[PDB]
Amino acid sequence: YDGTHCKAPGNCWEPKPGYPDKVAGSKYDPKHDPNELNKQAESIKAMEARNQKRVENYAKTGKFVYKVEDI
Amino acid sequence: NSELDRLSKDDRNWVMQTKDYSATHFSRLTEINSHNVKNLKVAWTLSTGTLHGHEGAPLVVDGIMYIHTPFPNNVYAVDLNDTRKMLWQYKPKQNPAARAVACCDVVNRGLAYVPAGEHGPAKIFLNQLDGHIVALNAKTGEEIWKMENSDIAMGSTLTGAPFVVKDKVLVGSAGAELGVRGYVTAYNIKDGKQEWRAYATGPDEDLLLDKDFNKDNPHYGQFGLGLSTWEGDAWKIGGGTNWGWYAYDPKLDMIYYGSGNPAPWNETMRPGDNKWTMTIWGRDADTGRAKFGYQKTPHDEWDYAGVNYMGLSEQEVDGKLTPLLTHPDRNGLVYTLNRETGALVNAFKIDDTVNWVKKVDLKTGLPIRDPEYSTRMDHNAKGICPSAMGYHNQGIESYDPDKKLFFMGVNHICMDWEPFMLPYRAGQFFVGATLNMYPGPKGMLGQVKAMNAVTGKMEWEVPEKFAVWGGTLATAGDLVFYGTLDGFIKARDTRTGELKWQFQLPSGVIGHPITYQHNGKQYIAIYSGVGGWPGVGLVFDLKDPTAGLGAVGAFRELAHYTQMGGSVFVFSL
Ligand SMILES: O=C(O)c1cc(C(=O)O)c2c(n1)C(=O)C(=O)c1cc(C(=O)O)[nH]c1-2
Ligand SMILES: [Ca+2]
């Protein structure tokens, strides 16, 4: 693997000698929990929805309020 | 922002961390110069009231200096006609649990500023460690608005400075050592409304790509790669946070920055190019849509987090005056790209001991890897240069347009590295490698270097006892100023590198110097307060050499020279 043999433009990765093409099912399988993987994006959606409440209250009242339970 | 651009051209001001949208860190002031800097003295000083690393530096605008601290990210304003009084203060109330998910000390790279306009009064912007972006009134300190960008419960924090462009403020990300998938966000300066958000990995809609993304260099890669260069859903925790610096070209209306490392550090857990971690981006300002994207370090094996500053300049390439970006990466290469097309102009080693890569092939754009200095499961890789700390880190550097030279504070640190398997749990660290770090082959830990970024010609090079972390300021007085980890500020002649002046500050420096004129006199200002990654050993009282992500052993001598601190020093003749 010297980084110059490309399967496609922008895609040059190769396994190193003796390592697998794919990790799923191998001794190096990360076995990630899909529920753990999704938590960040769920948290972002929740922050975005709060921010949008704060913005809408600003456009309605002309006064900024951070705490969403106070709107 | 055209008014902010105009204020940046006034030597009474220092309006952004980078000085100006090109990140020149260059002052036309010459009161202080190579022939009298030996007479520079301390004019006045301030305490920040905190310890831990003091990154970035003060802003000065319209006769007011603005100061910021590491966690809890207090801010205050000082009228330069009354230096002992605080005009106003802002004291955030943040959950102290934010500290536990900062990988590398609770540093903050500082404030941004926008002048008054249709959006309202002039504003100071602060990113808090706890993930909020805050807008303050620049004259009173009143909180105008505050939004949630980043969630500390996911290990996601903010450390890099906000960046104002037109009517927007850009907020980055941090937490790739905890599996945070990077993203940058533009908020409207008037009301804090999110305008756009561009992720570093994943589907094309998340990456936010122009329909003509990489039209000029299709060999860099174009569409589908934020999915196809990862196996399955590993991109969802895949790093690429952007905690460094920006640049902007108002004529192209393009914003430039670098995305950081893929997560975990264990390369074997994430086969593939891992796009678009480690990428130099050029994004349209209004829409955020990327016009170009160059991946410097495909399939990173070394934590060469690709966030370092972007220094714009206009220089001859094969006889034609060309708009450029120059970018000294963690990976030990100095990149220079055409900042309109993204075409690679040069990629040269910042020190010849770099060994992970043999060279970059300029035509293909690919770094030719040396497998002897790869990392991989079930192997302890030895003698890799650079280490994960890089041959360059977070310091903003400087460019003298008369000399066509960049001046850089450089690190000379190498490593051994062995990964390990580990699970991802949101909120916990997700590193997966054990490191030992040590000086590079030349035997010291730092250097200061002057170079032409188109030709790669090193003008001069000088050693430093420790890595030079905080960046540089250059002036038309033929001086480059910088601070050192061991607690000096120093000035060198930019023709030769000769040391002209040094002063013993209380604590090590991890930010940059600034200069400004006030009431007809030139001042130089700097923070003193060691921390950041090199200072984790002393800041956290760590002893195991592999602790602090492997920095503890390399920096074990730093505590013989400096304690923590927190002060601002102002110098004048
Ligand atoms: O991956 C990340 O998101 C992340 C964040 C930070 C941070 O927020 O300061 C650093 C790093 N990585 C890192 O790779 C690094 O070398 C580093 C040095 C420092 C420092 O301030 O001295 N912070 C960070
Ligand atoms: Ca990192």
State whether the Cα torsion B340-B160-B10-B288 is positive or negative: positive
Bridge partners, B258 (sequence order)? B280
Rounded Cα distance, B269 and B242, in Å: 22
Main-chain phi, psi angles of B561, to 5 degrees: -115, -30
| DSSP 3-state of B90 | strand
CA distances, B400 to each of B407, B461, B513 (Å): 8, 16, 16
Q: What is the three-class DSSP state of B114?
A: strand
**Rounded-to-integer distance, Cα B68 and Cα B57, Å:** 8
Classified as helix, coil or strand, B237 is: helix
State which amino acid sits at residue B274. Answer: N
DSSP B489-549: EEEEETTT--EEEEEE-SS---S--EEEEETTEEEEEEEE---TTTTHHHHTT--STTTGG
Q: Could you confirm whether B378 is annotated as catalytic?
A: no
Question: Exposed, middle or buried by CB within 10 Å (0-12, 13-18, 19+), for B509?
Answer: buried
- Kindly determine whether residue A9 and residue B220, on different chains, have CB atoms separated by under 8 Å: yes
C-alpha span between B250 and B165 (Å, rounded) = 9
Answer yes or no: is the C-beta of B29 below 6 A from any ligand 1 atom. no
DSSP A34-61: HHHHTHHHHHHHHHHHHHHHHHHHHHHH
Taking the C-alpha atoms of residue B109 and residue B56, their distance in angstroms, rounded to an integer, is: 4
What span, in angstroms and rounded, lies between the C-alpha atoms of B570 and B443?
A: 33
Element (H, E) at B41: strand B41-47
User: How many CA within 13 A on the CB side of residue B214?
Assistant: 22
Ligand 1, residue B532: give the atom nearest the CA: 22
**B68 in the Ramachandran plot: left (φ > 0), alpha (ψ -120 to 50) or beta?**
beta
Range of the domain at A31: 1-71
Q: Which residue has the tokens 């921010």?
A: A51
Closest residue of A to B270, CA-based? A23
Instruction: Test A10 with B421 for CB contact under 8 angstroms.
Output: no
Interface residue ranges in chain A relative to chain B, Cβ cutoff 8 Å: 1-4, 6, 8-13, 15-16, 19-24, 28, 30-34, 36-41, 43-44, 47-48, 50-52, 54-55, 58-59, 64, 66
Instruction: List the structure tokens of B245.
Output: 């610096």
Count structural domains, chain A.
1
Going by C-beta distance under 8 Å and a sequence separation of 6 or more, which residues neighbour residue B451?
B334, B350, B405, B406, B408, B457, B458, B459
Burial class (CB in 10 A: 0-12, 13-18, 19+), B190: middle
What is the stated resolution of the deposited model, in angstroms?
A: 1.8
Q: How is B281-307 classified by DSSP, letter by letter?
A: EEEETTT--EEEEEESSTT-SS-----
Query: Which H helix or E strand runs over B1?
Result: none
CB B512 within 8 A of CB B506: no
- What count of Cα atoms within 13 Å lies in the side-chain half-sphere of residue B265? 22
Contacts of B401 (CB under 8 A, 6+ apart): B24, B26, B313
The residue to which tokens 């035509």 are assigned: B363
User: Count of alpha carbons within 13 Å of B47, Cβ hemisphere only?
Assistant: 5
d(CA B241, CA B261): 7
Torsion of CA B553, B555, B557, B559, to 10 degrees: -110
**What phi, psi does B58 have (nearest 5°)?**
-70, 160
* Chain A residues inside the 8 Å CB shell of B421: 28, 30
| Contact in structure between B334 and B327 (CB atoms under 8 Å) | yes
CB contact under 8 A, B221 and A1: no
Distance, CA B59 to ligand 2 centroid (Å)? 27
Distance CA B38, CA B286 (A): 47
CB B258 within 8 A of CB B306: yes
Residue among B490, B366, B555, B427 nearest B150 (CA): B427
CA atoms within 13 A on the CB side of B340: 7
